[PDB]
Amino acid sequence: QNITEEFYQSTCSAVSKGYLSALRTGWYTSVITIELSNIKENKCNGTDAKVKLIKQELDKYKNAVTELQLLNSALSATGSGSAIASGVAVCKVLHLEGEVNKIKSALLSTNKAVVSLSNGVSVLTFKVLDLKNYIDKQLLPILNKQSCSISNIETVIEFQQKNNRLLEITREFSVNAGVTTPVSTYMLTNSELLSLINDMPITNDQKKLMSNNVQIVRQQSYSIMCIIKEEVLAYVVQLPLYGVIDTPCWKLHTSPLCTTNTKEGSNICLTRTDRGWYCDNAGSVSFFPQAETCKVQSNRVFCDTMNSRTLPSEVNLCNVDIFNPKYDCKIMTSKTDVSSSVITSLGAIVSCYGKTKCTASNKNRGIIKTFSNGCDYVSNKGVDTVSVGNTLYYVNKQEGKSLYVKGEPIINFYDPLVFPSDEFDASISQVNEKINQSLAFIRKS
Amino acid sequence: QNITEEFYQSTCSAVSKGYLSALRTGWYTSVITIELSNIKENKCNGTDAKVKLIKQELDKYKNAVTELQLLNSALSATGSGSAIASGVAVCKVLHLEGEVNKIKSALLSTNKAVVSLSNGVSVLTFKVLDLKNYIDKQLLPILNKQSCSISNIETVIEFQQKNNRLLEITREFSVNAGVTTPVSTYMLTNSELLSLINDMPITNDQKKLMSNNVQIVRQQSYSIMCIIKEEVLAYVVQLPLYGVIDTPCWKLHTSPLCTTNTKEGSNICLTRTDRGWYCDNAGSVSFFPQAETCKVQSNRVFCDTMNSRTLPSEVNLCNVDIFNPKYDCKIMTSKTDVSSSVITSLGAIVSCYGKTKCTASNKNRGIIKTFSNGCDYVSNKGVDTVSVGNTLYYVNKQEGKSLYVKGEPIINFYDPLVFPSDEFDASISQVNEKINQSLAFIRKS
Amino acid sequence: QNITEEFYQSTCSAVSKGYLSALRTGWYTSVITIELSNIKENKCNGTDAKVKLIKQELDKYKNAVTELQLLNSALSATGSGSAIASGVAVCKVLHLEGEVNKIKSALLSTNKAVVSLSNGVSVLTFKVLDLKNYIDKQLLPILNKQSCSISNIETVIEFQQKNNRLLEITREFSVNAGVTTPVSTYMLTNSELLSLINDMPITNDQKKLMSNNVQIVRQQSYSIMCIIKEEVLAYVVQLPLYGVIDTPCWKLHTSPLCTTNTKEGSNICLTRTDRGWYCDNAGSVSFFPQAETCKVQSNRVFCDTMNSRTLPSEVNLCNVDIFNPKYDCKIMTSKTDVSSSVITSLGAIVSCYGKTKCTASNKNRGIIKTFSNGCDYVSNKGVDTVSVGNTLYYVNKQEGKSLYVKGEPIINFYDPLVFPSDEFDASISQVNEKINQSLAFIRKS
16 A cells, blocks of 8 residues: 555546645744853953963854844744744743743753743753853953963863854854744754653654654754843744644645647636645644645655644545535636646646647656647656656656546536636636526526 | 724724834945955975964865855846845946955055945945955965974964854855845944944934844845955945834734625635735835735834835725725635634634634633634633634734724625625725626616 | 847837846756764773863764764655756665765775766766765874873864864755755865866866856755765765757736726726746747746846746747737736836836826936836836835846837727726636627627
8 A cells, every 4th residue: 555646537636645644733842041151351461372262262252142132132023923932932931030040940950951930831941051161160260360371272172162052053043033943953953852852741652753753853843042141041942743643644736627629729727726735634634735834754744734724524525526515626717728747746747738748758768658638647657757848847756556547527518608717716616606697698688 | 002903893804003114215335345365375395284274274265265256257137136236236336447446445544434436325344354464464474485384273273263254254155146135243243233333324313223123134134245356355235224214004914704604605705905014104005915024023113115015095994994985995705715813913813614613712721712603803812822623823912902893794795696706806896896797787688 | 239128018018138048957966975984982081181172073073974864864755846856866876785885986096986876877976075084094093092192183173174064064954954955165165066067978068158157056956965874975966957058038027007097996907927037948938937937147047947837939929919819918907006117127117007106217317207107118228216106126227228119008909898807817819708708798688
């Protein structure tokens, strides 16, 4: 079994079944903190070049802290916006009153610890960088003098190494208005992310999914700059929670269906509008119109429910009978008979109209299929490329069976004289109720 | 007062009033220069590892300069494009003939100075990096020899520190075709940007707005690579000017309005198309259809006028009476009764149709409101989340009064048999003039 | 000659002729390899600060390698997707079985060498970094001991310099799901890219085009992370091939055309929908609807054929006679008489309707042209800016002749009572066949 595909010659559409859902439904916010060192501008009387490198290094530390302070203005938000709303809610708790002392006390003994906030949110806190312990115990005795004298270059490089992460975090936040996605390694390293997942209150099997797909979790996470307060810098990393797992998913590919009679071009067209990803979800179906929202790993589909529409489960009847009386299947009518192709999971839909050259070829055996006027389909078995006019498409070399469901093209059932041929967002019954309107004008006059 | 909100049950739309405009209307171009050092490839006879680090460091300097020279090809542009047209105009003045000597003479004594160009543009010039003074007075005597001998690692690190900014500037320009936005700290640091704002010929109050919102000025600025010429590298930072300030702004949220009779789904819908940001501007109204163009800070709305349409001030009458005879209010008709929600500034519009579960809940008190078939609205008072089907929305926790304007849903005034139910971009009178067309066909036959 | 422009008052459209095509039609994949050093975690007994800097430096090397290993999960793909399909095909060959040994043997003696793969693809292989030779011959004898003793800071900096490129490559790949575009200098330096172009099996003249436009080749290239296998890291840089060169290209600008009678606003509009870039290509015309797909250098247009539609060459007849019986010209009808402007290559189209102030001005001479109600056009000769309402447009200061083709506005030929004024995607004959439908209802009743 695994990934299969069904093409409907009747409706010029294909369905890629066999996928398993993982759907984002929740968020887990985590507060990542960096201890900072509050220091006044010292005046080391000596002009030692070893110290001058430390002084200008310290200025980059000061400018980064100041840059982070200029982003706190940023945080107030509009309007939906709901993607980071759970993380922004945590930043507001960090302001009052003040809640930072509880994070300092918990991270005073360790680096990763759980903290309960004043609004009930129990957050995993992390201490990824301790700049305060460094600059005070190893840089303070160098500048806290008249003259400078004792200073080594290993401390200059050690400072640049411990500093660098901060500069990187500030740089990413600066050119992203305080919110970045995906979450970079500098925002949260893999060892920190893998440890963070293992400590989250989630299922034992949900941990293995996020651990086996850490690169996907980053692409669906947010890093939100919160406060800079009392020798502490804090930002929230908002991790996704997948409440819908292992339910079936299928991808719908649609292409224009037009009549191909010998006339100059006076033909009627028809195109299904319900293309996108579909996944069973809580007795209904979550529909994702923008395919760029879902990321497919192998046979698994990672989507965000916030970018989805929920349809009745009867929406799948359009893939069995477009004229079913249970669900009014969505179509659109026009006369734009321009050739195009869609590359499916295990094949390619080709809508060839006019004088366009539509072929499917093998890279060593030449052309193996030529498409006639109308909507057709070819499997990826033996095919390497698809050519429509002057643009070349590459067929997916994924293994799987393709089922060609032969059927009469639906557009042939309509009389072109009575056909409403410019419906932008209609449906099957919506076209039928308009055909009856035109027939009433003609017969009863 | 401050931020308030009005919901119109009649038209399924809400207005978020109480905002204050800042609108970009102009540009201030500034030329940021880096003195470079023109050096031929020296052959230091010794293989000293301290010098080999300087030699490969110097190669990164040469490759960055060469990379900047490959971007000057880039600059010619199409086509609108008008965002950087004022900055590109300055780059063309820098080419002739040559104007760079005037920038060298002005920046020979200081770092920030005003320069008048050959085409009347008086530009604030900046000298942010002096690589020529460094490599000639501290790196030239090291390689300008047979053997190498005297060379310290502090000079190797000092070179990497003075170099780094340049490498960063070239890297950002390289992967952005010579134009970057927002303007990063490496393109122009905060102290440089804050100083640059204080020297601009603008109002005393306009300086405080840009100084208090430096992160917003960056997001609406452009860094444009100009020339590399005579031991000088120059690029233009194009800063925004806000000519419209403190005028009222309001955001319009619209949602589908459909009849909800018990039939299988044979209902007529209606949706206002004029959603977006609106701001009073010079006796008219600037309309921003793409909400992503405006950035809201607190009660202040930062927009770019180049991405806006100018409508008569009577367009606000659609928020008082959709049937007013002064302005033909824009709507669209369809039959897509699919449930959805819109999160407003101080609430949420919910369009619930069919069997979809539409609720609004508090995180500790449970469900506090359930939405019936039709278009309704709930305030953010006491509400934490909104659920429509399988997708969960977070309501904005901003403080403000919400006004529920009760009224008969406008869709109930239309006879479904005579209703043109697939108008993609129509209006109130446009639907009425089409209803009269259908009534003339039926009665006078 | 060179760049010229023709404005059609009849159809409210302008054509920017005189451009020369370069069209992507193929891909050249190149495997860029970095030799890595497989090392177990040593325990240098001494706590030497010079070695502690090497140890933490070595950890960044280990984390980057681990980060690259977490991206190999990523590679499986959907669905079209065809942009990197030729590069993904090479990554799959690198997996079996194993093909990496052939790359090691070829790059054992040199750095750039040609390799023939097991699936016939002859790929240019590159060895841009030799970390294995460094860490084994200069870092292994430092940590491969009890105690540590001999260790210099020049080796610490040398390691950071040789390391840095790798960290950069991993960072870009990490936040881009293993595929980056444009190809940065760290993925492939200019000297490497210029050398790579010179060794490709392409025409002598095609090499000069890619060498003279290396910044454009990067913007149309892809860097694809392949495998990490046997002390080797490999990623594919997918370079564009331009099979269509020096064929004519022209850009079509369209704007709404509406009647301007004195009524309240009861006017009919008409707008050509076929705007975009057009280039002659293999006896047909490649049409690029999204202008952001093509990049114009001087008079040369760089486009990707995968983002194009192929139309019959008769599509240009709409720029000579919109009513020609050979090609049914695509238009759309509405009543949205809102003022707007389009900046062409050598002028500006202005659609002024209602009470909107539409002007074209010179920066020193003031207003030089005021636009009346209707669709007009002004050349860039003497014009600096165009004002429509509250938004200001900058006209392109490119040199070239503009031809004003006077003609009766096409919208004046239609009777508003019989005009179908809400066609979303129609054509000339499509509107005529609908006008005849309404005339049959009225006369034969």
